[PDB]
């Protein structure tokens, strides 16, 4: 049971719009909206969305496994050895948000301060003492972007596993010599850094020039969660505010995906006329180039929706019914929809490119969709006894012996393994990950799906407890 | 009663080193060390310090008022009108950490997300509705460093008030015409931005080329808190670890100040031989150029302590007794003292240049000295009934009317005014400031003075409660 | 009769290697090597080449016209109007080295100091007085690369004409409104700058992703000058020095072109065994990325010549027989061939990327191939009476009336038109072009073809008169 | 007899303004204006000047020797060894335009292509073979400004000699160890690069914060050439055009110097009322910050000429009688004087910051003052037999033996030594220097003094022969 299985099971349910059924529904953890900062929904004037993994939720592990296969094939096509063809995607290995160290070829899980929580070289998990040879302070400077790449997106899940596969393969293949910073094959040296860049390039190529989009749209049922409640919630949002889409995807792909997402024999509610997906949006913008979109952006273009090509020149007209935009910036949205920053709730899945940047650069309010949470929640509640025991050991150790330090590592390992080989997205044991820290700081609201907003009344006030400084308590 | 009065009153006390007297002492709020993240003191191997407002705490308002006078005089000497001479420093106006908007000539107090909490044009406090003309979203992008300057240091306190004085003077002087972005005097236009830069330049000039250091060292009793407990605590720290100084100041000034701070007729404890201030440090480094110091730094030089001039060339030797360093980088410290990042507790007062940068770039542990807290604490505890009422109004309003919104602003104003015209350093009403947010995120420990570490035993474990995500609760 | 017709007529001649026949041959202007700085051939140790328009000389106008057609088609395929399909390449319009002003949509011919010599808007030639509206000083700052693009290469000849075609078409098409900086089509504005970038992009696309290389190699006789004397001269050069190729092209294309250039039923001389083109080179380097190649370059890779793909990793071995390199830098050449800068004669056609950069950055000696010179020479000598008259008018006017100024413009126009609508590559009237100035300053030797070196003995000393300063005369 | 002696001897002459006396005067080489590109004086509308070494010509070697002494003293004051005090300026050593190589501590004289002509380490002149260890190609990349500094100005003459002195002193002082890249003194390493920067800093300090200007203005007769013909020529220029000053100096210094230059008991001609120096200029601009001045410049300020301080704010008014400007850009001049680029003759001494930049960035016409030419001309004409013999040997060697190569070096050395140890400013033997090349390319006119324009009638046409390409001859 993957996280997309949870979402697709909740998706197959019809909406019961009785008030009491909703309030009782939204108290169960899986359909809940979680709150980092209070947010008065009645002050929201525009609801905004990206598409990938928000409106269009890609099924797991099928879609990661497709991306992995096509990326492997691209690497082999450019000259990587045939043995790559024998890899097979394994969803139990990668957790999202790991850091790849291009100097030493390691996947790292770190906390908000760059402290190492997990270190794997290939599939070899390096215990604390042995990491100190390469990380004397058990610490990395994350902002050294020449060395470290943070695998922040669900799209990064195939390459997270692929990088470990590659390191494992070359380490154990007798034609190569392992070195501190890469592999030597006689008179060719492949550094982990250049190997890493080939992987990034091949992922980019699969998405832009390869066949991933084509293979997706030819079996959308296999690859995309479909939920009749999506047009219901969008319709309700449009009753109390304006609705816009700002996606990095092109129009042709967006049009195929969105058409599939709205393809029911009815409109918002069963028994109503079907309406095209564009009618649910006051503003549609593609080729957004986020996060640049939240700074100066690019020139505003107009899509010729008949042909799928951009018209020639910069678009200087007003907002019109049926016009589709390309590029521009977040000021385009605010100007054309007459909204100020905090009037906008932006719903996205990119912790950096959607949430952090719209919050910091524009003062937008934010809803982070976290797909894996639909399954992380289930592990969390089923194994609460593990975590409660860890909390209890932490408190006992503090009151103090070394027998307890070993019990702490044992429980920590046993808890993490329930999530995968790389542990929970949000923590390793009692130590929070960087990703968890970013969620709390930049996502005002978050949830496994934004559909969970359907179970809250129109002017609900999401509430979070105020923060007090230690000396204020 | 200023904050330096509180510190100087606690400084005049001799240390009673009975255990029970200490533990009872450190529970009173004013001598307490406050904890954002747990810190096991027994794992600390090096204690590091800056000098200004940490070891050498400048008395308030005397020292701000001196800096203000010399800066005013510098501006008049370069051609600013004589009326500036009639300004007089007023410590009730500035709170530290305000943002000066060079486009519109405003001082702003903002929260961690750039939301406006207070806006003053000169001494005119702009109420919410009127700020929306210049700030349509009640929001600023703080990282736009061309437009916004964050007055983060206590050294910035004179110019915080001076900028408001200048805006007030030119607005109300009939020889000038007020414009959106500055003042017009016939054929000369003075933008708030260029006016602002003249102020920054004049402050820099007073510190580097003017007479501020000279006037300080000629009346150190007037200008510098002196505490016999300082060499006691340094001596105790050196018993369980290494001790270093890394200051941006030059050697000559450091030597005059530090000599004054250690000028008692005794050493660490009364009755012991006096020892020179240098003997309390395993490594002394001046001209540190923080925050660049925590990146690549500058070349390591050696001070000729007899003449106060740098020797010629780059120093390539080892750590020696009596050598004083200049420049270098934080790696110099770690190499010469054989310490790793988390082995170091760095004690400073610059939330950015000392704490944030040493934490993010090097993984150092941090102690932030906040001088004003010695008085903010007293206001906080004396007027807790105001804040408790505000908390109660917040909770009541949430359960819901507009009569309560006005009561909320009334109590908020009345609470803020107890701290000054710009309110508490840490909040305005129930809304936390950017500065408070930075303290919680980057200062592992903080206190009005680092002397408060004297009241904790050698291997004390400072404890902070673990963070849980909303969905983990 | 185009310039490639002249070269192909001289190419069909067999080489007569009698000494007296050579010396008499090389004195005729068309087979001459022209000398800007003296060069002792006996001190040359390596001869180096690029490929395009040096070894592989593309026939004119056929090859420009192919590039024009494919570029037009690419623009139409992305949404430019169908009328573009009715353009047809016209070799009488463009001269190489014109500057396109992206602000005002003009082609400019300028001297070495940026003075305007010719200005055309579309096909409208702007006379002196009318240019002063947009160019008040009849001057452009060429180094303002955001505004001005210098159409330096023969590959730029199709787009030089295309840009004028486009400006002409949009100016005169009633669906558009002409503006100072571009064209308005209701709510779309196409600036000359963005129009210009679409053209650059489409040329790049034709070369890299389009079908230009494919169409070339499927009719090489139509598109490429073929000369049996090429392997003869290369063989002779290899007898007294080392020979290398450094081309920006990829291996697959280089291999097809070079194979065609050496496809005779014999080797260097008739009656000798044919040898593969690679055996004529001590070092073969592709994907050179000049001019970056003459600075830090890119990583050195090794071509798998069987598959045409780069091997995986950085190549760290030595020079081997049969190895083909990719990327690297000019230091690769000098290291692997044991040559110093002035030991190398580099033979290229890019006045900037081959000649200027290798001369300025590395001290290489230079031979600039100028294909058009094979025809410019013929015009020059046939119409010498026009130029001699202009010289005579210049001297007469100086001794002095306005009747002569008009005669000067008349003769200037009549002389320029013999070369094309944009005049001689080297001058307009008595005023030298920027391109001529760059040739004299950076090309030690130059010629219509490098084959002309065949007619000079092994250790010939090319001689140029010494320069004296005005006060030295 | 220095070059300033020649100028001061010609300065003491009264002007005889009979036409025939002038024409006969201007044909003698020393009072001649030399012409690189033809220039019709009647088309000139504005004459512009810098001050230092153009209007105010500093006497030699007195003024270099003062700058040397003050720079030495500054280095000793910051900790350089006392032995520096025993240096004494020696005008026979430096020639202007040498390149200091901060990697290897050498002064280099190079041609226009970076070929080495002379190499001195300290006072040790390195013969050709021995230079190839550090310069394998006898070549430097001049644009590598991190490594090479081009000592282009007469102000650079003191430090040119000082750098050689320093290298000589440290090489031969037993307290130091010579290394490839600097000097080691136990645990201090002084690289030639950091030594070089200390020298640059100390020169800058002497000019801006030291006592050079003060010592100059207290003995102007000793330090500044004074010529009654200067106000005569300025007055004549103002009769046919506009006159402006654009100097990097501040107003106070400019005012002292210019007042001295115009301090005669008469105005333009003897017997006329004296007029203040400002009345000879339509526009006076100080603090010009050339060469930035010819790009975007700095903000336009207004000088308070009573106090010598800048007024407060940006000046936005028009050109007024008596206003003195500060900063701005070259567009300020062109706007306020209504002149286009080629309408301006700019008279300066900085081959880069005055001539090259005004020519390339703005299309100004240029007059380069070269003070040393007043003496280089005398050496040139007195030793023409040496150069004519060298020319004859060059031609003979070309027709060919090694006995002549040695005679060529002998004559080359003997000719160069007549100019100084670093040879002629314009050449070494028959090889032209970089500086000569820049003069020919960027200075339309040049002369030992601009006063030489006095001997040419109002609308003289300076003439230079047209350039022909080798294939055009
Ligand atoms: O790793 C990447 N390389 C290239 N394209 C990506 C990558 N990750 C996501 N995308 C694209 O991003 C688009 C979704 O953007 P969104 O709707 O703004 O979230 C899809 O077109 C993806 O193909
Ligand atoms: O605003 C400023 N301009 C110039 N110098 C400053 C400023 N603020 C602090 N300083 C200097 O910083 C030094 C203290 O550095 P610390 O001991 O590292 O905290 C003193 O020499 C101050 O004069
Ligand atoms: O305008 C251009 N855009 C893209 N490729 C170009 C352009 N001009 C020349 N090339 C390529 O440059 C190569 C020839 O490089 P060369 O042999 O170093 O002179 C060929 O592969 C051309 O396709
Ligand atoms: O090496 C230098 N360092 C600092 N100032 C210089 C240097 N060289 C020239 N100057 C200054 O340049 C000014 C003359 O500028 P000019 O009149 O524009 O040529 C004088 O004030 C000099 O002191």
mmCIF file of N, CA, C and O in Angstrom, chain C residues 116-154:
data_model
loop_
_atom_site.group_PDB
_atom_site.id
_atom_site.type_symbol
_atom_site.label_atom_id
_atom_site.label_comp_id
_atom_site.label_asym_id
_atom_site.label_seq_id
_atom_site.Cartn_x
_atom_site.Cartn_y
_atom_site.Cartn_z
ATOM 1 N N UNK C 116 29.446 55.195 -38.558
ATOM 2 C CA UNK C 116 28.534 54.598 -39.528
ATOM 3 C C UNK C 116 29.023 54.861 -40.944
ATOM 4 O O UNK C 116 29.325 56.002 -41.302
ATOM 5 N N UNK C 117 29.111 53.804 -41.745
ATOM 6 C CA UNK C 117 29.382 53.917 -43.170
ATOM 7 C C UNK C 117 28.147 53.664 -44.016
ATOM 8 O O UNK C 117 27.947 54.343 -45.025
ATOM 9 N N UNK C 118 27.328 52.681 -43.634
ATOM 10 C CA UNK C 118 26.070 52.361 -44.304
ATOM 11 C C UNK C 118 25.039 52.032 -43.234
ATOM 12 O O UNK C 118 25.363 51.409 -42.219
ATOM 13 N N UNK C 119 23.794 52.449 -43.464
ATOM 14 C CA UNK C 119 22.665 52.111 -42.610
ATOM 15 C C UNK C 119 21.477 51.718 -43.482
ATOM 16 O O UNK C 119 20.994 52.531 -44.272
ATOM 17 N N UNK C 120 20.983 50.492 -43.322
ATOM 18 C CA UNK C 120 19.796 50.038 -44.035
ATOM 19 C C UNK C 120 18.724 49.582 -43.053
ATOM 20 O O UNK C 120 18.986 48.760 -42.165
ATOM 21 N N UNK C 121 17.515 50.097 -43.235
ATOM 22 C CA UNK C 121 16.339 49.634 -42.514
ATOM 23 C C UNK C 121 15.515 48.780 -43.479
ATOM 24 O O UNK C 121 14.905 49.302 -44.422
ATOM 25 N N UNK C 122 15.497 47.474 -43.252
ATOM 26 C CA UNK C 122 14.963 46.594 -44.270
ATOM 27 C C UNK C 122 15.845 46.715 -45.496
ATOM 28 O O UNK C 122 17.067 46.571 -45.411
ATOM 29 N N UNK C 123 15.240 47.006 -46.647
ATOM 30 C CA UNK C 123 15.994 47.294 -47.863
ATOM 31 C C UNK C 123 16.057 48.779 -48.160
ATOM 32 O O UNK C 123 16.400 49.166 -49.278
ATOM 33 N N UNK C 124 15.735 49.619 -47.186
ATOM 34 C CA UNK C 124 15.790 51.060 -47.364
ATOM 35 C C UNK C 124 17.131 51.567 -46.847
ATOM 36 O O UNK C 124 17.399 51.502 -45.643
ATOM 37 N N UNK C 125 17.965 52.084 -47.749
ATOM 38 C CA UNK C 125 19.267 52.611 -47.372
ATOM 39 C C UNK C 125 19.123 54.055 -46.922
ATOM 40 O O UNK C 125 18.664 54.911 -47.682
ATOM 41 N N UNK C 126 19.468 54.302 -45.666
ATOM 42 C CA UNK C 126 19.247 55.589 -45.019
ATOM 43 C C UNK C 126 20.450 56.472 -45.327
ATOM 44 O O UNK C 126 21.586 56.118 -44.989
ATOM 45 N N UNK C 127 20.205 57.608 -45.980
ATOM 46 C CA UNK C 127 21.271 58.557 -46.270
ATOM 47 C C UNK C 127 21.684 59.288 -44.990
ATOM 48 O O UNK C 127 20.923 59.372 -44.022
ATOM 49 N N UNK C 128 22.921 59.797 -44.995
ATOM 50 C CA UNK C 128 23.572 60.391 -43.841
ATOM 51 C C UNK C 128 22.712 61.258 -42.938
ATOM 52 O O UNK C 128 22.624 61.017 -41.727
ATOM 53 N N UNK C 129 22.085 62.302 -43.499
ATOM 54 C CA UNK C 129 21.248 63.189 -42.668
ATOM 55 C C UNK C 129 20.170 62.475 -41.873
ATOM 56 O O UNK C 129 19.973 62.782 -40.692
ATOM 57 N N UNK C 130 19.481 61.514 -42.481
ATOM 58 C CA UNK C 130 18.383 60.814 -41.820
ATOM 59 C C UNK C 130 18.858 59.811 -40.766
ATOM 60 O O UNK C 130 18.084 59.459 -39.866
ATOM 61 N N UNK C 131 20.109 59.345 -40.843
ATOM 62 C CA UNK C 131 20.612 58.458 -39.800
ATOM 63 C C UNK C 131 20.826 59.193 -38.488
ATOM 64 O O UNK C 131 20.812 58.556 -37.429
ATOM 65 N N UNK C 132 21.031 60.516 -38.540
ATOM 66 C CA UNK C 132 21.377 61.286 -37.348
ATOM 67 C C UNK C 132 20.231 61.384 -36.353
ATOM 68 O O UNK C 132 20.474 61.706 -35.190
ATOM 69 N N UNK C 133 18.996 61.104 -36.776
ATOM 70 C CA UNK C 133 17.882 61.027 -35.833
ATOM 71 C C UNK C 133 18.097 59.907 -34.817
ATOM 72 O O UNK C 133 17.980 60.127 -33.606
ATOM 73 N N UNK C 134 18.462 58.708 -35.286
ATOM 74 C CA UNK C 134 18.727 57.574 -34.406
ATOM 75 C C UNK C 134 20.182 57.484 -33.959
ATOM 76 O O UNK C 134 20.462 56.887 -32.916
ATOM 77 N N UNK C 135 21.115 58.056 -34.711
ATOM 78 C CA UNK C 135 22.539 58.011 -34.379
ATOM 79 C C UNK C 135 23.045 59.442 -34.435
ATOM 80 O O UNK C 135 23.595 59.874 -35.458
ATOM 81 N N UNK C 136 22.862 60.214 -33.355
ATOM 82 C CA UNK C 136 23.190 61.651 -33.419
ATOM 83 C C UNK C 136 24.647 61.913 -33.737
ATOM 84 O O UNK C 136 24.974 62.922 -34.375
ATOM 85 N N UNK C 137 25.532 61.012 -33.331
ATOM 86 C CA UNK C 137 26.949 61.146 -33.597
ATOM 87 C C UNK C 137 27.414 60.271 -34.763
ATOM 88 O O UNK C 137 28.620 60.154 -34.987
ATOM 89 N N UNK C 138 26.494 59.677 -35.522
ATOM 90 C CA UNK C 138 26.841 58.687 -36.550
ATOM 91 C C UNK C 138 27.811 57.643 -35.999
ATOM 92 O O UNK C 138 28.802 57.285 -36.631
ATOM 93 N N UNK C 139 27.503 57.150 -34.804
ATOM 94 C CA UNK C 139 28.434 56.368 -34.003
ATOM 95 C C UNK C 139 27.664 55.342 -33.186
ATOM 96 O O UNK C 139 26.586 55.641 -32.669
ATOM 97 N N UNK C 140 28.229 54.145 -33.047
ATOM 98 C CA UNK C 140 27.683 53.132 -32.154
ATOM 99 C C UNK C 140 28.811 52.633 -31.266
ATOM 100 O O UNK C 140 29.976 52.603 -31.684
ATOM 101 N N UNK C 141 28.456 52.243 -30.033
ATOM 102 C CA UNK C 141 29.381 51.577 -29.104
ATOM 103 C C UNK C 141 29.297 50.077 -29.370
ATOM 104 O O UNK C 141 28.407 49.407 -28.841
ATOM 105 N N UNK C 142 30.227 49.529 -30.166
ATOM 106 C CA UNK C 142 30.065 48.135 -30.598
ATOM 107 C C UNK C 142 30.032 47.185 -29.412
ATOM 108 O O UNK C 142 29.356 46.155 -29.456
ATOM 109 N N UNK C 143 30.774 47.499 -28.350
ATOM 110 C CA UNK C 143 30.865 46.579 -27.224
ATOM 111 C C UNK C 143 29.580 46.495 -26.411
ATOM 112 O O UNK C 143 29.518 45.701 -25.469
ATOM 113 N N UNK C 144 28.566 47.296 -26.731
ATOM 114 C CA UNK C 144 27.254 47.152 -26.116
ATOM 115 C C UNK C 144 26.596 45.950 -26.795
ATOM 116 O O UNK C 144 25.806 46.064 -27.739
ATOM 117 N N UNK C 145 26.970 44.762 -26.311
ATOM 118 C CA UNK C 145 26.529 43.503 -26.885
ATOM 119 C C UNK C 145 25.075 43.181 -26.571
ATOM 120 O O UNK C 145 24.514 42.276 -27.193
ATOM 121 N N UNK C 146 24.448 43.884 -25.632
ATOM 122 C CA UNK C 146 23.009 43.712 -25.470
ATOM 123 C C UNK C 146 22.261 44.310 -26.650
ATOM 124 O O UNK C 146 21.246 43.762 -27.081
ATOM 125 N N UNK C 147 22.768 45.411 -27.206
ATOM 126 C CA UNK C 147 22.097 46.089 -28.306
ATOM 127 C C UNK C 147 22.588 45.633 -29.683
ATOM 128 O O UNK C 147 21.770 45.431 -30.588
ATOM 129 N N UNK C 148 23.897 45.467 -29.871
ATOM 130 C CA UNK C 148 24.477 45.275 -31.201
ATOM 131 C C UNK C 148 25.025 43.858 -31.333
ATOM 132 O O UNK C 148 25.718 43.367 -30.439
ATOM 133 N N UNK C 149 24.726 43.211 -32.456
ATOM 134 C CA UNK C 149 25.282 41.903 -32.787
ATOM 135 C C UNK C 149 26.037 42.008 -34.109
ATOM 136 O O UNK C 149 25.489 42.480 -35.114
ATOM 137 N N UNK C 150 27.291 41.581 -34.099
ATOM 138 C CA UNK C 150 28.188 41.722 -35.236
ATOM 139 C C UNK C 150 28.151 40.418 -36.020
ATOM 140 O O UNK C 150 28.510 39.354 -35.495
ATOM 141 N N UNK C 151 27.692 40.492 -37.271
ATOM 142 C CA UNK C 151 27.452 39.293 -38.082
ATOM 143 C C UNK C 151 28.752 38.929 -38.797
ATOM 144 O O UNK C 151 28.944 39.160 -39.995
ATOM 145 N N UNK C 152 29.640 38.297 -38.025
ATOM 146 C CA UNK C 152 31.053 38.114 -38.336
ATOM 147 C C UNK C 152 31.358 36.923 -39.232
ATOM 148 O O UNK C 152 32.437 36.877 -39.836
ATOM 149 N N UNK C 153 30.490 35.925 -39.272
ATOM 150 C CA UNK C 153 30.828 34.670 -39.924
ATOM 151 C C UNK C 153 30.101 34.553 -41.247
ATOM 152 O O UNK C 153 29.098 35.227 -41.498
ATOM 153 N N UNK C 154 30.643 33.695 -42.107
ATOM 154 C CA UNK C 154 29.913 33.343 -43.311
ATOM 155 C C UNK C 154 28.605 32.644 -42.974
ATOM 156 O O UNK C 154 27.619 32.790 -43.703
#
